[PDB]
Amino acid sequence: LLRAVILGPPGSGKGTVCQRIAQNFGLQHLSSGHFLRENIKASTEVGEMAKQYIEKSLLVPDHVITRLMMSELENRRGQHWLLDGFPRTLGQAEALDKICEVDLVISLNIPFETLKDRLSRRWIHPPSGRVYNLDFNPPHVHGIDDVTGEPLVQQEDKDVAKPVIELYKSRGVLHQFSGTETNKIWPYVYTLFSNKITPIQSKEAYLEHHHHHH
Questions:
Q1: Is 53 annotated as contributing to ligand binding?
Q2: Is 143 known as a binding-site position?
Q3: If 174 and its partner were Cys, which of 101, 169, 191, 213 is the partner (CB 3.0–4.6 Å)?
Q4: Interacting residues of 18 by C-beta distance below 8 A, sequence separation 6+
Q5: What is the DSSP letter of 99?
Q6: Count of CB atoms situated within 10 Å of the CB of 151
Q7: Annotated binding-site residue? 131
Q8: Is 58 annotated for ligand binding?
């Protein structure tokens, strides 16, 4: 099974890329933010450990996230992985290597004009004030408010450690892209996934996601 990772700082278009990958290749969009939303909702020991930092709008320790990810991924060995925003540290990367063979790593960058606004991973629905922080409570659909279906606004005010890039660069599974509009990068990303997973709209099992069971 495919083990793919997508990395990049907020404002690099990682959200748009992951959504497009999920829809064209039928892969489940995984991230510590998604798993946390679940864990915090169910009130697991890990969710609790993380709750404390989240309430104060502080950072969750890298090891807490690691425990979370290793538990969740180990329970998903039987399916293709689209990992968004993880690993962020060498320690995390090493842990990941112990449970799988990473097939490809896409590294994204922020285009110049976008840096000036120093974007964060917080997306707000202005009409209600609902804030979706991609690290712990992402929306069902990227850039969209779960409740109203109305568009979100990414708020103003990195997560790509150099050694993690070097690590994958050495394995020769790294594919970096200069900060640029996402459409310029897309066909290249599409081809990379296409060489490993067949586009779901071209199959007999039309638009069927791999983890689907009727």
A1: no
A2: no
A3: 169
A4: 6, 29, 82, 84, 142
A5: T
A6: 11
A7: yes
A8: yes
Structure tokens at 196: 């490993």
Beta carbons of 177 and 183 less than 8 angstroms apart: no
For residue 87, whether the previous peptide bond is cis, meaning omega lies within 30 degrees of 0, is yes
Which of 38, 13, 17 has its CA nearest to residue 140?
38
Asked if residue 12 belongs to a known ligand binding site, the reply is yes
Which technique was the structure solved with, according to the deposited record?
X-ray
Q: Is 71 annotated as a binding residue?
A: no
Give the relative orientation of helices 62-74 and 32-42 as an angle to the nearest 10 degrees: 90
Q: Give the resolution value in Å.
A: 2.3
Q: Is 105 annotated as a binding residue?
A: no
Superfamily designation of domain 1-214: P-loop containing nucleotide triphosphate hydrolases (3.40.50.300)
**Residue 23 assigned ligand-binding role:** no
44 is in an annotated binding site: no
Q: How far is CA 141 from CA 23, 94, 95, 152, in A?
A: 11, 30, 29, 10
Would the annotation count 171 as a binding residue?
no
Breaks in the chain (C to N > 2.5 A) come right after 157
